[PDB]
Amino acid sequence: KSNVVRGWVFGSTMNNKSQSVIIINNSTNVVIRACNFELCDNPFFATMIFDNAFNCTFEYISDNFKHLREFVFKNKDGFLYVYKGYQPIDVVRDLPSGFNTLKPIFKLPLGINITNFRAILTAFGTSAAAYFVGYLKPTTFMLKYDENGTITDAVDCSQNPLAELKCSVKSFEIDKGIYQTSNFRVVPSGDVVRFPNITNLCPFGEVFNATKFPSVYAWERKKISNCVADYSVLYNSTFFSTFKCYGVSATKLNDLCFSNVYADSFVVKGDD
């Protein structure tokens, strides 16, 4: 009641060393801005959000609890998605039970790394208000669309075996009987990585920075063994006009171990 919550700040470090985005309702405008902020520890509305801002990248300006306001936030491929919904309530101190569908309002191209967020609240000392936070996960859902196009119900397949039986049949209705369900599943609870004990870096300098290179007709081959293939060291100095992988993706190279490695060297004219 009396709009205590005013907005959010999303950021990684929440200081001036990293960019952050502030979305607030300032009483006479909705303002969104993404800059390097000197965020205060206690951000509230009497406007004590930040001291100074520099290197700004994005800006957007607009033209007995009673009120429940619901939002969903996601971040993806440099886009922050916001979904919104509202419901009148009379519950005293709990989250009312029920079903409501949120609708998109914002798709912002910020291109920042978000690991943390903090809410912005007014101080009067302070009025009674509550907010609630939950976390999202990849899941399969079955949605029911009505004749007008409204989503009025849904089924979460992972909740229990009956919900999966429903999702498998594609029905909210099930007749009496016994049905065969998927086999018992177990989810992993640990991570194991086993690699050989190697303490030496591969000889990039000797191969690439060799004083003399042979003729193509008399090409030379050299064995490579017992070494750590980092190749990020080359980023500082050595650069290649041609780099092509055939049987392997370039992205997977860092996570692999290689057997029977050989390197062949020669010199040709550009056209060849």
Binding site: E70, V72, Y83, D94, L95, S97, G98, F99, N100, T101, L102, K103, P104, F132, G134, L136, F141, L143, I151, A154
Partner: peptide, 14 residues
Amino acid sequence: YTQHTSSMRGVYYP
């Protein structure tokens, strides 16, 4: 810090 239940909240248009 109190723990509450989210019964069927959070569905949005895909």
